[PDB]
Each structure stands twice: as structure tokens, then as C-alpha cells.
Amino acid sequence: VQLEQSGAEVKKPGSSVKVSCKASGGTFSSFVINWVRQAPGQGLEWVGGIFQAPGPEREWLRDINPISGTINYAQRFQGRVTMTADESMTTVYMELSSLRSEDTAMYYCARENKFRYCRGGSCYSGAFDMWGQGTMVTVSSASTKGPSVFPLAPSSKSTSGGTAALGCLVKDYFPEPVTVSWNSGALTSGVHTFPAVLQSSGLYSLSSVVTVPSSSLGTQTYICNVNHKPSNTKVDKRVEPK
Amino acid sequence: EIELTQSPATLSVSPGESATLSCRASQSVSDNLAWYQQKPGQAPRLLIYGASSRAPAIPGRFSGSGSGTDFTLTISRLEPEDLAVYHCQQYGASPWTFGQGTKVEIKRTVAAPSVFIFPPSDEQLKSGTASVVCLLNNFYPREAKVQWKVDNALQSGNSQESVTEQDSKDSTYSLSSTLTLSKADYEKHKVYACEVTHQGLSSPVTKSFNRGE
Amino acid sequence: WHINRTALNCNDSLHTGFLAALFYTHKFNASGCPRQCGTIPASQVCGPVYCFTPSPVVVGTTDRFGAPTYTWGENETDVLILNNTRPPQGNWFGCTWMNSTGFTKTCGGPPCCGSGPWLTPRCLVDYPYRLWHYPCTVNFTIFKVRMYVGGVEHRLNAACN
Ligand SMILES: *[C@@H]1O[C@H](CO)[C@@H](O[C@@H]2O[C@H](CO)[C@@H](O[C@@H]3O[C@H](CO[C@H]4O[C@H](CO[C@H]5O[C@H](CO)[C@@H](O)[C@H](O)[C@@H]5O)[C@@H](O)[C@H](O[C@H]5O[C@H](CO)[C@@H](O)[C@H](O)[C@@H]5O)[C@@H]4O)[C@@H](O)[C@H](O[C@H]4O[C@H](CO)[C@@H](O)[C@H](O)[C@@H]4O)[C@@H]3O)[C@H](O)[C@H]2NC(C)=O)[C@H](O)[C@H]1NC(C)=O
Ligand SMILES: *[C@@H]1O[C@H](CO)[C@@H](O[C@@H]2O[C@H](CO)[C@@H](O)[C@H](O[C@@H]3O[C@H](CO[C@H]4O[C@H](CO)[C@@H](O)[C@H](O)[C@@H]4O)[C@@H](O)[C@H](O)[C@@H]3O)[C@H]2NC(C)=O)[C@H](O)[C@H]1NC(C)=O
Ligand SMILES: *[C@@H]1O[C@H](CO)[C@@H](O[C@@H]2O[C@H](CO)[C@@H](O[C@@H]3O[C@H](CO[C@H]4O[C@H](CO)[C@@H](O)[C@H](O)[C@@H]4O)[C@@H](O)[C@H](O)[C@@H]3O)[C@H](O)[C@H]2NC(C)=O)[C@H](O)[C@H]1NC(C)=O
Ligand SMILES: *[C@@H]1O[C@H](CO)[C@@H](O[C@@H]2O[C@H](CO)[C@@H](O)[C@H](O)[C@H]2NC(C)=O)[C@H](O)[C@H]1NC(C)=O
Ligand SMILES: *[C@@H]1O[C@H](CO)[C@@H](O)[C@H](O)[C@H]1NC(C)=O
């Protein structure tokens, strides 16, 4: 019914990672479970696929059976990716070894039905019709570190007409993600929490800004709630005028 | 392997108009071609399999056509929800390969950015570093140029910027640029300015402050 | 007889996996679990077609006048003429097959009540595709049985509950 993948992973270069894809509402039986990866900005890349045989082949139909081997890997990953399934066929794993920084990517599992339809002596696929939510895999030499949170104080230099901008700078953390809310989720409108940027230091940095009526400065209290779960770091920063 | 070229790289379409995406394969892949929709921060979703056969629950405005090498995805009446990256994939010959994706953003009227500048905090200065943030708020289109000047010296290679995804109601973008200096360098200098160039501005806008004033 | 005489107009739109179970022998778990025999168009048929004179026999595609065709039933004029495997004497004849979207179809059957391969409410004729057409009979027990119709002796295997 639905594909649920394991949680985000952070790995040092040269290491290995093992990501799981679990079926809810049934079994992977008779499907190919594929793995597709997507480097942070880039397009999709097939890693390989593993077929979950419902049972022994009926060999009088061997010549038109569309399955060519239970396990297929893209050439780029041969020798360092292993795909397995448990005997229940409710979980398929992808283990990727000798990790490199270019292996940093979101890893999706996706179900493929190679027996979508048949006609005239051959059967055709339904493509990748059901996708897991993705498992982010970060490959970096950096060590886990909670952010420093600094105010982005409103000023005359951050007002236009009757509206002011203020924010929080969330600097020097590893790894992704952080969450930022404002006033414990009470203000969401007008908030821009920018995509983190990876600094040359290997640590990430992010700002979160919000626009508010200028007549609220020094009357309304503004707190950014920063949560960096990988380092167990939570910070509430009051942001007030210059 | 089979090479899939998607064109154009970016599409800007006004709501209610049609979007035509192209996907061209090196060798022939014979209707074994699929289209996926990837909305911001989400997993890819299947729209079309077998070049023209349409996945269930996919609205009728999505149509794929073609065979062999030249394929097209047509989005007839565009809704703002259709903001996404569209990927084509061939499964005619292993290994399966994907195009590089076509981003479809929502066309809207041009809007100049509101430009805000933030000096480093005193809390950060005592840590040894100064980050100066220039904020470009709610502009369209996404192309924008930020340039930093410190006492009129052009800064290059010591700033980084981030752009938000297009806003779902506004159809607008925002941009943050952070200039990073040491505390010592920060205090050797007076005028900090970011200069913003954008199609909605008659000429570049500069927002600046004088340190300690 | 030829592989190509199997009608192969198969369509698993809902991704149930029934079409995969044509190519592999798929056993079920507990959770998952008249009319006369004329001429059916191959377009409505997926996988092999069995008829039962008690004894099981396969029907291959032909044209409308009974000459064998070898186009996997893709031809609009391709049919399975079930009645041409009806033995000239004996009052027992049923058939079973899968329609295009994975629903088991039956044209009775035992003289009576039962339908197709079924001999009693308890028992049906065993044949190579029983578990595909009747997956919920996976843990039926297999008995060697013997039946007489029209004087002729039929030796077959029956699956019984
Ligand atoms: C989809 O299915 C259709 C079938 O419905 C199929 O069409 C057949 O195609 C094959 C191959 O191209 C044709 O085969 C040729 O047959 C030639 C003889 O044709 C005459 O005889 C046929 C059989 O007649 C017997 O059976 C009928 C029915 O019981 C009976 O009435 C007769 O008296 C006789 O007993 C007959 O069906 C056919 O009828 C068609 O044509 C007549 C006259 O044109 C027309 O009036 C009809 O209305 C009907 O359209 C005709 O009377 C045969 O000579 C020929 O052999 C040549 O080639 C081979 C190989 O090169 C050589 O060895 C040989 O020496 C000859 O050079 C060949 O075997 C067959 O006739 C078609 N059937 C029909 C009904 O058209 C399609 O191909 C299928 N399509 C796909 C996608 O696969
Ligand atoms: C393969 O074989 C299966 C099994 O027979 C075929 O599926 C059947 O196809 C026939 C012909 O189309 C349909 O009549 C059967 O489904 C339907 O019956 C419906 C009755 O449902 C009730 O509830 C609806 C709710 O919307 C009410 O509106 C109705 O009034 C009914 O009270 C009817 O609604 C549908 O319109 C339809 O007639 C259908 N049965 C099953 C199990 O699906 C299948 O089509 C065959 N496949 C092929 C391609 O040959
Ligand atoms: C039973 O069903 C099978 C599957 O449908 C049938 O196989 C089909 O047979 C037809 C015969 O007309 C083929 O159609 C032609 O295929 C040729 C292929 O030629 C290539 O290979 C040869 C041999 O090495 C080589 O010399 C050539 O240079 C080619 O590279 C094409 O050239 C023709 O254009 C035409 O497409 C089908 O391709 C074939 N399909 C499959 C999947 O095998 C078989 O004919 C049926 N048997 C009977 C008795 O009817
Ligand atoms: C498989 O079965 C499905 C459902 O029976 C068919 O779906 C139909 O597709 C056509 C053309 O795309 C539509 O015009 C119909 O409205 C669809 N029916 C519905 C209501 O789902 C499908 O064509 C069949 N064939 C294949 C090869 O998938
Ligand atoms: C049939 O018996 C088997 C084998 O012991 C059991 O595993 C299976 O679940 C049963 N199937 C059903 C329909 O319960």
C-alpha cells in the first residue's frame, strides 16, 4: 500500500550505509523494488533493482518471461552496492559501500510491476509507480555540531513603508536538518526559512526571516525556535530592535 | 547507455496556459518512456507510463505523446499546484536512465525585491566572526544579482546565497546573501553595502550601513 | 500444440500481481482467502484455457472456423472454441480461464450445482493452473480418483477440502 524508508544517515567517507524500504499494507511479492538516488540539485539516477519472486518459475513460459535475473545494478555501482530482501518480502535493503562525498543524495525506493500488461507474446512494465519518501544519506568528514543562533535585528535599514524584516542566523551546524519556527508556530505567514548552504568548513548555515508590521517592533515579542535534533540542541532566541 | 535530453531546462507558464516539455533519446526506446512529477520537497510521483498511458489518479491535463526517440509531455490548463520538476525515464534498455529534469515555475507579473541589510550581531562579533546578511524579499523572476562592497572594495568569493522555492500563493522568490568576514577585518572598515540588480529595478539598488552608527 | 496458441491479453491495472502469478507458482496465505460452454473471443482471455471432460484438457486459440492460430490471441478474429474438446458422448464438460483483468471465469461444469472443474462442493479437478485460477484451494489435499461418464474411465487427481 505504501513505502516507508528508514531514517536519514550521515557517514564518513570510505564507510557503508544500509537503507531499508518497508511495505505497509502488504508485500513486495512479484515486484521489482528499485533504488533511485538524487544528488541535492541534480536529476534522478537508477542504482538498481531487486525482483521479489512469488515462487518457482513456471518454465514453459521462460522465453517470454520479462525478468532477466533477480538482481540488476547500474554499471557505476557494481562492486559496491548490495540489494537484499527479507524472507517475508516486506523489506528490501540497499547497502552502499566505499562511500564518497558524491554519494551524498536522497535515496528513493520505488516499486515496479514488470507484469503490468501482456499482449502478443510479451509483457510490459508499469514504470516506477509507487515511491518511498526518501532517505537522505550525507557523506562527510565533518562531526556533529549544534548551531549558533544569532539575531537579525530589525532596524531602519530593514523596513520598507510600514513593514519590517527580522530574523535569525543559524550558523555552523552539522549535519542537516534544522527546524525553525517563530513564536512556537504562532507566526508562519511571511516566514522564509532559506535552504541551508554548505560552507567550505563543511558546516551548514541558514537564515530564517519574517516580515512584520513596523508598529509591532518593541511591542510584539519575536522568538525563533531552532531545533537541531542530530545534536540534541534547541535554542529560543529573542530578536529585538537594534 | 541510452541518453535522455530534456528541453527546455526551465519553463515559466502562466496559470491556465499549456506547458510543453520535450524528452529526446539517443537510441530508440519504443514507447517505454515514463514521466514523473516531483513537487517541492516531495518524492517523485508517476504521471505517465508507456509514453501515453496515464497513471491512475493523474488529472486529464497531463498527456504524453511520441515513440522511438522524440517524446513530449503536455500540461494543458496549468494550475499553480503543478509547480514541480518533471523527469522523463526510459526503460527500453538497461540500465534505466533519466533526463536531467525540467523545472516548471508559475509565470506572474514582475516584482522588484524589497532589499534589507543586517549588520552582524554583537554576540557573533565576540565569537571572532562577522556575518552580514542582505535579504531580497518577494521578487519575480528568480534571476537576481547581489554584489557586496566594503569601503567600495568589491567582495568576491566570501559570500554565499540561498533562494527559496517559489511561493505557492505569491509565486514569488526570496534570496538571502551572507557576507562573512573576520571580526578584525570587519572593524577595519566602515561602509558595508549590498548592491542588488534585478529586472524589476530601473537601476541597481544599494542598501548600506556604516559600522557602529 | 504450441506456446503461441495461448491467448495472452492480460492487464493488471490495479497492480494486484495476478499476472505475475501466470509466470511463477504463487502460493497463498490464509489472509487472502450454471452456464454452457460455447466459443469465447481470445481478446477476453489471459493465459491458458482448460476444459474438463472430467479429465483436464487445454484449448488453444484458433480462427473462427477452427484452424489453429499462433498469434497469442492478439488477432481480433482469434477465438477459443471450447465445445470442440467436448467428447461426443458423456454428459460432463466444464471449462475455466482468466479474463483480461484477472477474474476467474467458468462455464459449468458437473451435470447437476458445481461449475467448471469442480466435481463436488468439496472437490475440483487438479490441473497445472488450478492455483492460479483458484488460489484459495492452495491447501486442498490431492486424491487419486476415478470416474465413469459415457462408459469411459477417467483417472485424474482431485483437490479436496
Ligand atoms: C488475423 O486472422 C486472419 C484470419 O481470420 C488472418 O488472415 C489469414 O491470413 C493467412 C496468411 O496471410 C491467409 O493464408 C492464405 O490462405 C490462402 C487460401 O485462402 C483461401 O482459403 C481460406 C481457407 O478456406 C478453407 O476454410 C474456409 C472456412 O471453413 C472454407 O469456407 C473454405 O472452403 C476452405 O475449406 C479462406 O479462409 C480464404 O478466404 C478469404 O479469401 C477469400 C478469397 O480471397 C475471400 O472471399 C474470403 O472472404 C476470405 O477473406 C480463401 O478462400 C492460401 O492460398 C495462402 O497460401 C499462399 O501462401 C503460402 C505461403 O506463402 C503458400 O504456401 C501458398 O502456396 C500460397 O502462395 C495462405 O495460406 C488466410 O487466407 C487468411 N484468412 C482470411 C479469412 O483472410 C490474418 O493473417 C491474421 N492477422 C494477423 C495480424 O496475424
Ligand atoms: C473480467 O471479469 C470481471 C468480473 O465479472 C469484470 O468485472 C465486471 O464487469 C461487469 C461488466 O462491466 C460489471 O457489470 C461488473 O461491475 C459493475 O457492477 C456495478 C454494480 O455495483 C453496485 O454499486 C455501484 C456503485 O457505484 C452502483 O452504482 C450500482 O448500481 C451497483 O448497485 C456497476 O456499478 C458497474 O457499473 C459495473 O456494471 C464487474 N464486476 C466486478 C467484480 O468488477 C471485468 O470487467 C472483466 N474484465 C474484462 C476486461 O473482460
Ligand atoms: C510465435 O510467437 C513469437 C513471438 O510473437 C513469434 O516471434 C516473432 O516472429 C516474427 C516473424 O515474422 C518476427 O517479426 C519479424 O522479426 C524480424 C527479426 O529479424 C531480426 O532477426 C533476424 C534473425 O537473426 C536477423 O537476420 C534480422 O537481421 C533481424 O535483426 C524483423 O526483422 C521483422 O521486421 C519482423 O519484426 C517477430 O519479431 C518475432 N517476435 C519475437 C518476440 O520473437 C513467432 O513468429 C511465432 N511463431 C509462429 C509459428 O508464428
Ligand atoms: C486495462 O484495464 C483498464 C481498466 O479496465 C483500462 O483502463 C481504461 O483505459 C482507457 C484508455 O486509457 C480509458 O479510456 C478507460 O476509461 C479506462 N477505464 C477505466 C475506467 O479505468 C486499460 O485500457 C486496460 N488496458 C491496458 C493496456 O492497461
Ligand atoms: C494452507 O496451509 C498452509 C501450509 O501449512 C499454510 O501455510 C497456509 O497459510 C494455508 N493457506 C491458507 C489458505 O491458510
C22 vs A66: CA distance, rounded Å: 12
Task: Answer for the pair C4, C70: CB distance below 8 angstroms, yes or no.
Answer: yes
Task: For residue A66, give Cα distances in angstroms to A23, B92, B111, C133.
Answer: 23, 12, 54, 22
A87 and A11 in a single domain? The answer is: yes
A36 and A122 assigned to the same domain: yes
* DSSP state, residue C62: B
Task: Identify the three-state secondary structure at position B14.
Answer: coil
Do A166 and A134 lie in one domain? The reply is no
Decide: C161 in ligand 5 pocket, CB within 6 A: no
How many C-beta neighbours within 10 Å does residue C41 have? 16
C135 CB within 6 A, ligand 5: no
Q: Is B180 in a helix, a strand, or coil?
A: strand
Residue from A114, A158, A170 to probe the interface with B (highest B Cβ count within 10 Å): A158
Residue A134 sits in the same domain as residue A168? no
C33 C-beta closer than 6 A to ligand 5: yes
Are A160 and A132 contained in the same domain?
A: no
Instruction: Map residue C46 onto helix, strand or coil.
Output: strand
CB of C22 less than 8 A from some CB of A: yes
Neighbouring chains of A at 3+ CB pairs within 8 Å? B, C
DSSP 8-state secondary structure symbol assigned to residue C24: B
Do A8 and A62 lie in one domain? The reply is yes
Tell the burial category of B153 from Cβ atoms under 10 Å away from its Cβ (0-12, 13-18, 19+). exposed
> Does C138 lie at the interface with A, CB-CB under 8 angstroms?
no
CB contact under 8 A, B97 and A46: yes
> What are the chain A neighbours of C74 within 8 Å (beta carbons)?
119-120
Which residue type occupies C1? Answer: W
Cell 540539485 locates to A41
For the CA of C71, the nearest atom of ligand 1? 83
Contact B141, B199 (CB under 8 A): yes
Q: Which among C161, C112, C104 has a CA at the least distance from the CA of C130?
A: C104
Q: So where are chain B's domains?
A: 4-106, 114-210
CB-CB neighbors (< 8 A) of A145 in chain B: none
Residue C50: how many other CB atoms lie within 10 Å: 22
Q: What are the beta bridge partners of residue A71?
A: A50
Helices (H), chain B: 122-127, 183-187
Atom 4, ligand 3: residue with shortest CA distance = A121
What Cα–Cα distance (Å) separates residue B44 from each residue in A133, B36, B158, C69?
Answer: 9, 6, 35, 44
Burial class (CB in 10 A: 0-12, 13-18, 19+), A85: buried
Among candidate residues A88, A117, A139, the one where a domain is terminated: A139
* Cα nearest neighbour of A111 on chain B: B46
Nearest CA in chain C to A64: C23
C-alpha cell at C80: 477459443
Instruction: With beta carbons less than 8 A apart as the criterion, state whether B180 and B158 touch.
Output: yes
Grid coordinates standing for C76?
481480433
Chain A: residue whose CA lies nearest to C12: A116
SS3 of A74, please? coil
Cell 526506446 belongs to which residue?
A: B29
Nearest to A169 by CA among A184, A152, A154, A144: A152
Cis peptide bond N-terminal to B80, omega within 30: no
Any idea what the CATH number is for the domain that residue A13 is in?
2.60.40.10
> Gap positions in chain C, given as the residue before each gap (C–N > 2.5 A)?
33, 112
Check whether residue A132 and residue A173 sit in a common domain. Answer: no
Side-chain-side CA neighbours of residue A195 (13 Å): 16
CA distances from A186 to A183, A191, A224, B169 (A): 5, 11, 11, 19
Q: What are phi and psi of C82, to 5 degrees?
A: -60, -40
Of A46, A125, A150, the CB nearest to B121: A150
DSSP B61: T
DSSP one-letter string for B73-123: EEE-S--GGG-EEEEEEE-SSSSPEE---EEEEE----BPPEEEEEPPPHH
C-chain residues within 8 Å CB-CB of A121? 4, 8, 72
CATH superfamily membership of B4-106 = Immunoglobulins (2.60.40.10)
Is A121 within 8 Å of C4 when comparing Cβ atoms? Answer: yes
- Give SS3 for B62: strand
Helix and strand numbers, DSSP H then E, in chain A: 0, 22
Pairing of strands A71-73, B173-182: unpaired
Residue B139 cell numbers, joined: 521578487
Resolution of this model in Å is: 2.2
Inter-chain residue contact A151 with B123, CB threshold 8 Å: yes
Measured in degrees and rounded to the nearest 5, phi and psi for residue A221 equal -85, 135
CATH homologous superfamily for the domain B114-210: Immunoglobulins (2.60.40.10)
**Surface-to-core class of residue A69, CB atoms within 10 Å of its CB (0-12 exposed, 13-18 middle, 19+ buried):** exposed
What are the residues whose beta carbons fall under 8 Å from the beta carbon of C10, sequence distance 6 or more?
A115, A117, A118, A119, A123, C19, C22, C46, C47, C98, C100, C102
Q: How far away is chain B from the Cα of A59, in angstroms, using its nearest Cα?
A: 23
Domain extent at residue A44: 2-139
Cell numbers linked to C116? 467448471
> How many C-beta atoms lie closer than 10 Å to residue C132's C-beta?
20
Q: State which amino acid sits at residue B116.
A: F
The residues facing B164 across adjacent strands are none
Is C59 within 8 Å of C95 (Cβ atoms)? yes
Give B166 Cα–ligand 2 centroid separation in angstroms.
45
CA distances (Å), origin A49, targets A30, A114, A222, C56: 13, 11, 50, 39
Q: Taking a C-beta distance cutoff of 8 angstroms, is the pair C154, C148 a contact?
A: yes
Q: Are residues A207 and A104 in the same domain?
A: no
Q: What phi and psi, each to the nearest 5 degrees, are found at residue C3?
A: -50, -40
What the block records as the C-alpha cell of C151 is: 462408459
For residues B50 and A129, what is the distance between their CA atoms, to the nearest angstrom? Answer: 12
Exposure class string for A136-149: b at 16+ Cβ within 10 A, else e: bbbbbebeebbbbb
Chain A interface, best mutation among C2, C23, C72, C133, by max A CB count within 10 A: C23
Residues A11 and A120 in one domain: yes
- What gap in Å lies between CA B139 and CA B170, rounded to an integer? 10
Nearest chain C Cα distance for residue A8, angstroms? 29
Residue with cell 508499469: A126
Number of domains in chain A: 2
Buried b (16+ CB within 10 A) or exposed e, B121-141: beebbeeebbbbbbbbbbbbb
**How many residues can be counted in chain C?**
161
Degrees to nearest 5, angle at CA C153 with C148 and C155: 105
Distances from the Cα of B213 to the Cα of A22, A115, B2, B122, B192, angstroms? 59, 72, 62, 13, 12
What lies within 8 Å, CB to CB, of C65 at 6+ separation is: none
- Out of A109, A139, A169, pick the residue that ends a domain: A139
Residues B167, B168, B173: CA angle, nearest 5 degrees: 15
